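Hello again,

I reread your note about wanting to compare the complex against the isolated chains. To keep things tidy I'm splitting this into two emails, and this first one only covers the full assembly. Below are the input lines as submitted, including protein chains and any nucleic acid or small-molecule components. They are followed by the predicted structure of everything together. The single-chain runs will come separately.
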Amino acid sequence: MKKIAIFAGDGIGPEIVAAARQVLDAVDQAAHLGLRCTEGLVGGAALDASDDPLPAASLQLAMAADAVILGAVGGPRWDAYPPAKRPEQGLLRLRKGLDLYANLRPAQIFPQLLDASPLRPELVRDVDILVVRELTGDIYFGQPRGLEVIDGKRRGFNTMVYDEDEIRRIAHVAFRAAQGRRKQLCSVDKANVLETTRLWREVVTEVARDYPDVRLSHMYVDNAAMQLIRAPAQFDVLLTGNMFGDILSDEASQLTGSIGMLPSASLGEGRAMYEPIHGSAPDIAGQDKANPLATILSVAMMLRHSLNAEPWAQRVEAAVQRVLDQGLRTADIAAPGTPVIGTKAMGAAVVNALNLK
Amino acid sequence: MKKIAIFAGDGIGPEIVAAARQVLDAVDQAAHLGLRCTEGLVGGAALDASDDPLPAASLQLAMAADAVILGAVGGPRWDAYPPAKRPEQGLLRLRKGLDLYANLRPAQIFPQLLDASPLRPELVRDVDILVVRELTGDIYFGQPRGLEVIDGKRRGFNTMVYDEDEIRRIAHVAFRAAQGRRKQLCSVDKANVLETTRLWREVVTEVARDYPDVRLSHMYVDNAAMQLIRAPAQFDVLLTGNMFGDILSDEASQLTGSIGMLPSASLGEGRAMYEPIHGSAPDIAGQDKANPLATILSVAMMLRHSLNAEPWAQRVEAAVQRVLDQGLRTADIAAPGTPVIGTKAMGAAVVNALNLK
Ligand SMILES: CC(C)[C@H](C(=O)O)[C@@H](O)C(=O)O
Ligand SMILES: CC(C)[C@H](C(=O)O)[C@@H](O)C(=O)O
Ligand SMILES: [Mg+2]
Ligand SMILES: [Mg+2]
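Full-complex prediction:
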């Protein structure tokens, strides 16, 4: 029996999770996984009920689970709150608390959604990239950090740090991912300015000896920002830190064109959290407009990386393709004047497209 | 009388500065500017001569000058050199030595060079962005930093840091730049995760009160990486830090399509350095192939920002446009099967296109 902790969150979080839960419950019944799901509050929903973005109870729930599903966190409703109590702090505490250091963000375009891409057609025709971003270390969690007043002058500071063990584990994930893809890994750094990232380059080069079958390349983060646009098809697996991964992942996501179709996995030792990478989009919250396909595709990642159900992870991914083939579109992926369906209907549509006996 | 310190550097640097020199000399003579130019060593050229990327002599020449011109620094030739002596250290030490805190990198696309752009023509057609990047602070120059061993494990660290004065001065340049443009300023940070960048947002918000004519908006760095390609025309002046500015400016450069056309200005109090932003292109170094136009346009920025020769800055800029209308193209900006001219010829073409006598 597998325990799944659910943290819908803020904005469109609740509705996109409900839609994806339809699909999840469907696969569970068909496959007989015997999953037990529990719901906990996170982000702004948690602040509203407990004045804390990740209550202790919510944290223990996640710790006690095998897989974690999160909808979204964030919204201007909580700006009046202190920085340490902001909605995304709960997300950061989940990642850090569960030590989910391997963030996997696959970037590819659905053939029926190619026109949504900002780049010229011929460039992004075959963009299939996997950003493997380190999630629990770096400047994000480095100490010391903070704001201070030195001689009447405000000074802000943050510490970027990584030790050889943190770099080695994320590298193994990226190298193993490359082997199961096109055998190409690009480690991104700023080794000629930032010493932390030079150690990053050195340790990845050492681990590269363990994967003679993969072609390793190093690239500076600024140059990588140009290459993603200039020739995206050159990338297979892109490895980088927390900070650089945050930026380059969003860049990779935009060039696919449809952010509401992009899933993600955050893996650690014996745990994992799955969430869409599109945010809480507050302005459409509760309007049944949100695209749940990214959350649904994240469930497919969970079936694969956490529930030992590859055949079913594929069937979920196939149903999503099927829904698109049959012309079903949510507002974000539909052309002007073209028919559009809501969050609820899109969920029930994938369940049907599952062609369950 | 004004002094100009010239540092050609490595790779294509010597040839692109010579072409640019043809233009500077043509303008100096015609305008009667009375400029005193001196040449120094920087980067690998300085290493080969002094085993130091920025010898004390080079620093004093630059410190004595009114304006500095730099071609390019870097190359695999100096990989055998210790991290502290790599060619790029000379560049950083110049920016820091002369306290050139305001980096200006205008991202515009030339009408006849629109086909080089990677974005869908309708998006890029009207791109007119100016990236104002803080150049002397941030994690780039933050202390402490280094590589150590704790309990037998390697640890890499760097310090990101900014005080209110550092932010106030770069904010002023950006707000002022925006006034003379579309009066729209976008400040990029990661205020929800990094405290240094939250102070950045706060101080910028403070200085914004001095510029009621310019509209200020804040955006997270990851979102900016998306917004640049999704809808580049939304940006006028984009203000951000050293590291973020490093990544975002390169992304903005790529969407214009032709990196060989982009100029830059690093301004400080009474000092200024001008360099292109394409790198040393070691592979074509010394083949008279390099596009000298970015450097020429950098000289144009110098006429405007240092030599107080705005009308002559415009004429150089007008001459570069004329050359393109004439259909003159170096390899990098030439369509396949189109006539291609060398570095030297392209420089002469601009001087001729100045229509002097
Ligand atoms: C919301 C924020 C704290 C988070 C991050 O910076 O990692 C987000 O931008 C992401 O990439 O998932
Ligand atoms: C070479 C490097 C130190 C420098 C920087 O990172 O600022 C360069 O990439 C640039 O953009 O001028
Ligand atoms: Mg992000
Ligand atoms: Mg750069």
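For quick reference: Residues A 246, 250; B 222 surround magnesium ion (ligand 3) (CB under 6 Å).

B.
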